[PDB]
Each structure stands twice: as C-alpha cells, then as structure tokens.
C-alpha cells in the first residue's frame with residue numbers, strides 16, 4: 001500500500017509503519033506524500049499529506065513531530081503539549097502515543113522491547129548517528145539492551161552515500177572501527193550508514209536488528225532523497241504502543 005510495515009518479530013503491543021512518497025497531494029518535486037513542513041512545499045498540502053498518513057496508518061493519535069536538528073537529544077513523550085521538541089529521537093511507554101521521525105536519506109531507526117511496553121524512534125543522519133543518537137535512544141529504555149529490538153528503516157545506502165572527510169574524520173574520532181564502513185570511491189568515500197548503525201547498536205548491546213535492505217536514493221519510485229533530488233519532500237517512520 002502507501003505504507004511499509006517493518007518485517008521484525010514485532011511484539012503484540014507494538015505497531016509501526018514507515019511512509020513512502022506515494023498517496024499524497026503535493027506537486028513535484030514534493031510528489032506526493034510530503035510530510036516535511038520546512039522543505040518549501042505548500043503548507044496546505046503538507047497538512048493534507050499528514051492527515052492522509054494518520055488515516056492510512058490507523059494511528060491512535062497525531063504523531064509527535066520533532067524539531068529535528070541532526071543531534072543526539074531524545075524527547076520522552078510524557079504528554080502534549082511540550083515546552084520544546086528540539087530533539088532527533090523520541091521515547092514512549094504510553095499506550096496510544098505515536099513516535100515519529102522525518103527522513104529523506106537519514107536512517108530512521110525504530111525500537112521496542114520484547115515485552116512490547118516501550119518504543120522509540122530515532123532520526124540518524126550521519127551527524128546525529130556519529131554524535132550518538134541511537135545510543136542515547138537505547139539509554140532511555142527501562143529494559144536492558146539485550147531485550148531491545150531495532151528496525152533499520154529506509155536510508156541512503158552504500159551504493160549512493162558518497163561522503164568526504166567532514167564525515168569520515170568525525171566517525172573515526174568517536175570509534176576507529178567505523179573505518180570499515182567507509183570505502184574509497186575516487187577522491188571521496190562511500191559510507192555504509194546501516195553498518196555504522198549496527199556498530200553503534202552493538203556498542204550498547206542491542207543485538208536483535210532488522211531491516212536495512214532499502215535505498216532511498218536508488219528506489220526513487222518509493223522514496224524522497226535529499227542527495228538525489230536536492231529540493232524534495234520527507235517520509236517518516238512511526239511506532240506506538242497499541
């Protein structure tokens with residue numbers, strides 16, 4: 001349909017979905033289910049696309065949209081309204097509360113515990129992934145990392161994610177083993193954002209990791225991609241306790 005449903009061993013109390021570009025009202029280059037409000041689209045179309053996602057996903061409440069800044073801060077969803085939503089991840093243990101991250105190449109990661117009593121969503125672009133957003137998201141859970149599941153959503157894969165030293169140096173400063181995930185490609189590198197996520201998740205003891213098969217740049221019928229399109233829309237990934 002419009003929506004991707006993560007293929008992971010989802011506990012009964014957990015629901016998740018990840019949007020695609022299909023099924024909205026936005027015009028090119030935002031065509032069509034653009035959920036992002038700061039990328040130059042018509043605000044009335046973004047509002048309608050967000051309502052369509054709400055209906056298609058059977059969400060129990062409106063998603064808690066974050067003021068994403070490519071950092072490592074996590075908002076605990078203790079109840080609307082919020083003083084500040086300046087964060088790149090959210091955490092919930094409240095039934096019906098919808099965690100949401102907005103992406104167009106950055107890695108969305110969805111998290112839940114085996115008990116299906118706590119969920120989280122993280123926006124892991126290269127800058128936030130390097131800074132520790134995933135480790136910070138795991139640290140918000142009451143449960144131990146051995147009992148946490150992670151789903152790697154659609155991101156820019158290593159076929160397409162060309163980077164320079166701004167990026168490789170940053171990662172090698174935090175954890176030298178990141179070098180494996182950078183492959184020389186002329187004067188630049190191809191970076192494997194899924195590998196870097198798997199490193200950071202293993203570092204905090206998250207072992208049960210799913211997804212990581214999609215490519216936002218390559219699969220242009222399905223996804224917006226900042227790197228491919230420059231001016232483009234945003235998908236989002238969603239998780240909640242039923």
Ligand SMILES: CC(=O)N[C@H]1[C@@H](OP(=O)(O)OP(=O)(O)OC[C@H]2O[C@@H](n3ccc(=O)[nH]c3=O)[C@H](O)[C@@H]2O)O[C@H](CO)[C@@H](O)[C@@H]1O[C@H](C)C(=O)O
Pocket residue numbers: 102103104105106107124125126127156162163164165166167188226227
């Ligand atoms: C995957 C990811 O983190 N993408 C993010 C990143 O874009 P990116 O595309 O990486 O741009 P760069 O940071 O400016 O550059 C990162 C590195 O990549 C080199 N490069 C860039 C372009 C190119 O063609 N070739 C090339 O080698 C460049 O020299 C630098 O070393 O930075 C943008 C903000 O500037 C974000 O909006 C974007 O977030 C997305 C939307 C989201 O939230 O989903």
